Design an enzyme around this catalytic site. Sequence first.
Site, PDB file in Angstrom:
ATOM      1  N   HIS A 195      64.096  68.145  36.446  1.00 28.33           N
ATOM      2  CA  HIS A 195      63.730  68.866  37.763  1.00 28.33           C
ATOM      3  C   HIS A 195      65.171  69.996  38.043  1.00 28.33           C
ATOM      4  CE1 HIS A 195      62.049  69.784  41.756  1.00 28.33           C
ATOM      5  NE2 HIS A 195      61.003  69.848  41.164  1.00 28.33           N
ATOM      6  N   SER A 235      71.837  63.865  40.025  1.00 30.01           N
ATOM      7  CA  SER A 235      71.624  63.171  38.892  1.00 30.01           C
ATOM      8  C   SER A 235      71.771  63.930  37.818  1.00 30.01           C
ATOM      9  CB  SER A 235      70.595  62.224  38.643  1.00 30.01           C
ATOM     10  OG  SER A 235      69.363  62.880  38.853  1.00 30.01           O
ATOM     11  N   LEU A 282      70.154  60.202  49.927  1.00 31.22           N
ATOM     12  CA  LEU A 282      69.506  61.461  49.997  1.00 31.22           C
ATOM     13  C   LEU A 282      69.196  62.209  48.473  1.00 31.22           C
ATOM     14  CD1 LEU A 282      72.145  63.376  52.235  1.00 31.22           C
ATOM     15  CD2 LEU A 282      70.360  61.948  52.947  1.00 31.22           C
ATOM     16  N   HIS A 283      69.455  61.171  47.514  1.00 32.10           N
ATOM     17  CA  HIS A 283      68.671  61.662  46.166  1.00 32.10           C
ATOM     18  C   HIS A 283      67.667  60.718  45.631  1.00 32.10           C
ATOM     19  CE1 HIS A 283      68.213  63.684  42.510  1.00 32.10           C
ATOM     20  NE2 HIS A 283      69.005  63.211  41.811  1.00 32.10           N
ATOM     21  N   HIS A 341      63.744  69.344  50.880  1.00 30.61           N
ATOM     22  CA  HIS A 341      64.135  69.588  49.321  1.00 30.61           C
ATOM     23  C   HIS A 341      65.370  70.408  49.323  1.00 30.61           C
ATOM     24  CE1 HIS A 341      64.130  70.314  44.966  1.00 30.61           C
ATOM     25  NE2 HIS A 341      63.877  68.850  44.847  1.00 30.61           N
ATOM     26  N   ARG A 396      54.669  67.653  42.116  1.00 33.77           N
ATOM     27  CA  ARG A 396      54.820  66.520  41.772  1.00 33.77           C
ATOM     28  C   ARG A 396      54.279  65.398  42.972  1.00 33.77           C
ATOM     29  NH1 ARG A 396      61.190  65.962  41.015  1.00 33.77           N
ATOM     30  NH2 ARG A 396      60.684  66.806  43.312  1.00 33.77           N
ATOM     31  N   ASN A 401      58.364  65.617  49.575  1.00 38.09           N
ATOM     32  CA  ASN A 401      58.692  65.577  48.040  1.00 38.09           C
ATOM     33  C   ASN A 401      58.215  64.671  47.458  1.00 38.09           C
ATOM     34  OD1 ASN A 401      60.655  63.095  48.125  1.00 38.09           O
ATOM     35  ND2 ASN A 401      61.905  64.581  49.611  1.00 38.09           N
ATOM     36  N   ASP A 453      59.208  61.562  46.152  1.00 38.56           N
ATOM     37  CA  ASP A 453      59.519  60.415  46.566  1.00 38.56           C
ATOM     38  C   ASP A 453      58.535  59.758  47.710  1.00 38.56           C
ATOM     39  OD1 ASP A 453      61.720  60.391  44.839  1.00 38.56           O
ATOM     40  OD2 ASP A 453      63.060  61.171  46.634  1.00 38.56           O
ATOM     41  N   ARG A 490      84.339  73.179  36.043  1.00 35.76           N
ATOM     42  CA  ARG A 490      85.426  73.345  36.898  1.00 35.76           C
ATOM     43  C   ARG A 490      85.440  74.282  37.839  1.00 35.76           C
ATOM     44  NH1 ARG A 490      89.896  73.374  39.117  1.00 35.76           N
ATOM     45  NH2 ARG A 490      91.550  72.025  38.829  1.00 35.76           N
TER      46      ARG A 490
END
Lengths: 434, 434
Positions: A239, A245, A274-275, A321, A330, A376, A378, A424
Amino acid sequence: AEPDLKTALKAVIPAKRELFKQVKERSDEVIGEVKVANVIGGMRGLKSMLWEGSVLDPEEGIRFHGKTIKDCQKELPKGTSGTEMLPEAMFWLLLTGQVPSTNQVRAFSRELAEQSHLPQHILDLIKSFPRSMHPMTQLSIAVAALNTESKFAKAYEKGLSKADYWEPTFDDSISLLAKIPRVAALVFRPDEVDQVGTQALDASQDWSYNFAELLGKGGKENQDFHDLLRLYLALHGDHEGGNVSAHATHLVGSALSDPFLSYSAGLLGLAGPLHGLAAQEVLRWILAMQDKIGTKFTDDDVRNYLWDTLKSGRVVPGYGHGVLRKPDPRFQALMDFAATRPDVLANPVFQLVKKNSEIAPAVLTEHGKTKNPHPNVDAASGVLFYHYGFQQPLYYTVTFGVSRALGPLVQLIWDRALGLPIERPKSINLLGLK
Amino acid sequence: AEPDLKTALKAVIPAKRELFKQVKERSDEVIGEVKVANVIGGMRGLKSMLWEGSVLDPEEGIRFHGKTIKDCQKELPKGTSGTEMLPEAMFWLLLTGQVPSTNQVRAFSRELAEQSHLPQHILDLIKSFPRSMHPMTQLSIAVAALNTESKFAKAYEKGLSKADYWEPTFDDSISLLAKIPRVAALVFRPDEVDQVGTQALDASQDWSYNFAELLGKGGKENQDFHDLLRLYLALHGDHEGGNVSAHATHLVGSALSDPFLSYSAGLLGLAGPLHGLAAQEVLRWILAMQDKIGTKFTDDDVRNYLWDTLKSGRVVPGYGHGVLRKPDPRFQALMDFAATRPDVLANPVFQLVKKNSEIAPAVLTEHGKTKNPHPNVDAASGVLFYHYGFQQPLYYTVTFGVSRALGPLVQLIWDRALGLPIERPKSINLLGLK
Ligand SMILES: CC(C)(COP(=O)(O)OP(=O)(O)OC[C@H]1O[C@@H](n2cnc3c(N)ncnc32)[C@H](O)[C@@H]1OP(=O)(O)O)[C@@H](O)C(=O)NCCC(=O)NCCS
Ligand SMILES: O=C([O-])CC(=O)C(=O)O
Ligand SMILES: O=C([O-])CC(=O)C(=O)O
């Protein structure tokens, strides 16, 4: 035979490198602005990283190489049984930019079956976990523990040429993909590690099918669930780059940590409330709501439970989201899966999820904090697993962890192939902004 | 008894929140540009994250709340013996913005002694690690495995208000800090897990002292090493937000994953050769040079070895930096530690490190590929441990991992106190950049 995945990747590599060179000539080109909001707001809206396999449209939703979910559902090969797109075919698409033939995918599933086995020490490690250890904690550890099998780590240590970094990265990626369902199954079944950890997979069968076998839902009698699992694993695979992740995997990968260590970091990111831990949190939250509001409830009962949740200083799980401003396709895809199954639609817990999706957006808008009041993915995923007999929500993000290996492993292979540098960014304190 | 750490933090929280509010009013203020380079170059030079405890001055080196290293060496409390600044006092500084008194730090060291013990399952887990498993892989796992003791994760799971996040995050941070030396010692000493894992610490002794005791380097005969360890741990604690370990910790923390999981991700970032392994690479590189040039060498012998290294298409380890353009004050700090020890100065390996720091920058400049010809802290750290009997460089990143818990855990505590959102940028493919 038709070319295998590694061969198919190799054909595509030179074209990607040439495009990278062309983009690089315009390094100095200005594309956006950095504001104070971006720094303090978790980089929100800052187009700052490269991800190739997928790009997320705020309104349209995700596209995979410009193809929509419905496009992937139509074009990607199915299994020997069922009607849903195979996740391994999605992996093939994400990596090569091309839809694999059914034969290529059959060959690829066979390879994945062949490489599922684990070293004994991984079994001993899993056996050491206390029963009370959270499942995402266990999954993260075991994946990092598999870095003893890393060809990239060993080859980097020996001495390796930058142009060939991708190959060991690819080998490790395929290896981890093959193994992760079995590891996940060991997390699900702590009392049966010796059997689950060594049992042979059906060599004729696809990845999702085999994952279900290890979960103890193998065989013809469980074929409906196999289709759900295929669909589910394919939808969650990738995604874009900015999700925690994916990002974590790439960030740790950029320091030349191997794919087992990098995706482990991803899994730790995915374990956040939160994820991906939200998949778990949605169903715990729905079950609690059901327990309070009972079996026959009004719209107001759901509204009150949502508002009480918000007034407690807690989030409504499964809504909102980072990028999407519309309902997640989804999410709609999983509801459409449910739409043709009357027994799923008759499940009270599913109905509670459905009813909550018609009420929660208004309550979240009245609250006025969120940019996105809509559901979302989930919101819907946990209830479907619940329906097919997976009733312990503490494990739901584990299945996500299997899926979410797909996209980030692809990007790591590309990261190494293009020779992308360490990630970085520049940091600043509050006093420096004032 | 003077204010304790939590109380000292509480006094400064409201002032930070007020400053955050003031900066937030200018959210829409433009501060920078995003170019194509930033996307393909790992966000290099992109001011895109908040870090409070430290700001890298590009020419003057890192400052901790505007204090230089020498300032910290002078002002921060020392232990009951020795002359080097205590890392726990650095933690206090990083967190509160203030130099603690010696009494305050003694009380804080006692707390860290008291909380160092580990649950038995962590001992069983570490015992399951194969002897071949890489030390940073082991350290990362054990830290994630300590999430069974996470007060934040358990309190989030029971239902918690967002406003109350920081306290459990602080409690977990102090808990992880207390434990991480002991875990590190277990990684160093796989044959002594039962003793090292359970031994009671002297509460009147400081953190580094106790870490050295767990390493088997306790007692008066090892007092110089105690001071080295103290100094080292204090210097590597924090180095802005953009470095991979700090960033990963913050990134995973932003999804509300607890400090054990978040810092585990950090440690996985630290395991990457480009991030954490340079101390190891420097010493192996120096030992190779010594093997060739002997212990009685001329300047030209070192020049030739450097030139050979460069013409083989390899970097000279410990020289250069992403942001610093000058010699690292952390590097100078470690050389000055050697300056008052005649036995260290008499060590041929140290002398080779010293001689290489005179020679290498000129050679690197003549070679012309590198932007920063000057030494970084990794150039000097390995040799010092080696001198005090830690001659397995494979373990040097482990000790870095103990140090590098300090800064990122502080920032996590602040992240939660300020209510910073999830870190979630937008990604883009190469075709979208064209
Ligand atoms: C997904 C999520 C993390 C996005 O974060 P984001 O992009 O920073 O969110 P926004 O820009 O909309 O946030 C602005 C405010 O609205 C709040 N908010 C956003 N979505 C919310 C939700 N579903 N419920 C309650 N509050 C929410 C935020 O916490 C923030 O409040 P704060 O400043 O008081 O902390 C967020 O929607 C959320 O945490 N809730 C969803 C939980 C979940 O389902 N996670 C999986 C997402 S796929
Ligand atoms: O990865 C997901 O499913 C959710 C996502 O895109 C994000 O967190 O931004
Ligand atoms: O730090 C690096 O390796 C890259 C760099 O900044 C340089 O080109 O000097």
